Ligand binder design. Structure first.
Ligand SMILES: CNc1ncc2cc(-c3cc(F)c(-c4cccc(C)n4)cc3F)c(=O)n(CCCCN)c2n1
Length: 267
């Protein structure tokens, strides 16, 4: 965290583009390179109880160096406000790209494959993402797919062992990936109609969700593989990258620009 430099001289703050954990996010311009950045501004007096979680997320992102993880450029403190500078991804989130209509299985498989490449990287680095969901998967304007917003070390994407506060590992991300697969196929996670407190006991109580609808058997089996109540029965990210659903359906990420365009024309 840079304490002398004035982020308001270094960056031009433009329109709001989201609301993440602990503050609002803006499109911005790096005034020296003219590159577009994403800027989160957190007021450290209003978000005092969460400062350690913010620091922890910055530390983790600063240790990542992967095409599949959104880049962290640095942070600045001006008066009471912490500016966090991230890579800007102009395709938006995968959740956004669900708005014009359903994804086809090639789009689903391509997005899941790239998420798996990010998880393979993190898990190989002995890291856990902890908040895999379509809202936290960002696309560049070229169709590149990257992970954003790590969870701190809403219940719909949480593995049962995470809810039961059991010691969990990277297989919790594999469960969340299975929920995200359903969300990419159907538009919403399981139980999305229910009150979160009900979901909190339904996830440990119920059999795991399945993907319902006219979807290929390999996609249903991909979901089933991820959504096993027993974490040791969930495959690794490495293994899921070789799953038949991925191998038979995933294509070049550049094809996802058609998905981004469809979202542009829908608005
Ligand atoms: C539309 N294109 C686009 N491109 C890039 C980003 C980056 C981020 C972003 C990610 C982060 F991990 C942190 C971060 C890092 C360390 C600590 C903390 C507390 N936060 C900050 C961020 F601003 C972001 O929010 N959006 C908004 C959508 C969020 C979806 N969930 C972006 N939107």
């Amino acid at each position: 965290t840079n304490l002398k430099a004035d982020p308001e001289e270094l960056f031009t703050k433009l329109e709001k583009i989201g609301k993440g954990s602990f503050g609002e996010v803006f499109k911005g311009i790096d005034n020296r390179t003219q590159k577009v950045v994403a800027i989160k501004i957190i007021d450290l007096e209003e978000a005092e109880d969460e400062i350690e979680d913010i620091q922890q997320e910055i530390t983790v992102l600063s240790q990542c160096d992967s095409p599949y993880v959104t880049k962290y450029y640095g942070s600045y403190l001006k008066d009471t406000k912490l500016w966090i500078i991230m890579e800007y991804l102009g395709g938006g989130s995968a959740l956004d790209l669900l708005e014009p209509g359903p994804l086809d299985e090639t789009q689903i498989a391509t997005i899941l494959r790239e998420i798996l490449k990010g998880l393979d990287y993190l898990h190989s680095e002995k890291k856990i993402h902890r908040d895999i969901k379509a809202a936290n998967v960002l696309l560049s304007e070229h169709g590149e797919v990257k992970l954003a917003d790590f969870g701190v070390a809403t219940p719909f994407w949480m593995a049962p062992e995470v809810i039961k506060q059991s010691a969990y590992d990277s297989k919790a991300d594999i469960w969340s990936l299975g929920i995200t697969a359903i969300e990419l196929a159907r538009g919403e996670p399981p139980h999305s109609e229910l009150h979160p407190m009900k979901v909190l006991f339904l996830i440990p109580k119920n059999n795991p969700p399945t993907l319902e609808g006219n979807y290929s058997k390999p996609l249903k089996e991909f979901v089933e593989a991820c959504l096993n109540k027993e974490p040791s029965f969930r495959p690794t990210a490495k293994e899921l990258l070789k799953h038949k659903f991925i191998l038979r359906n995933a294509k070049k990420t550049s094809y996802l620009t058609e998905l981004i365009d469809a979202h542009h024309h829908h608005h």
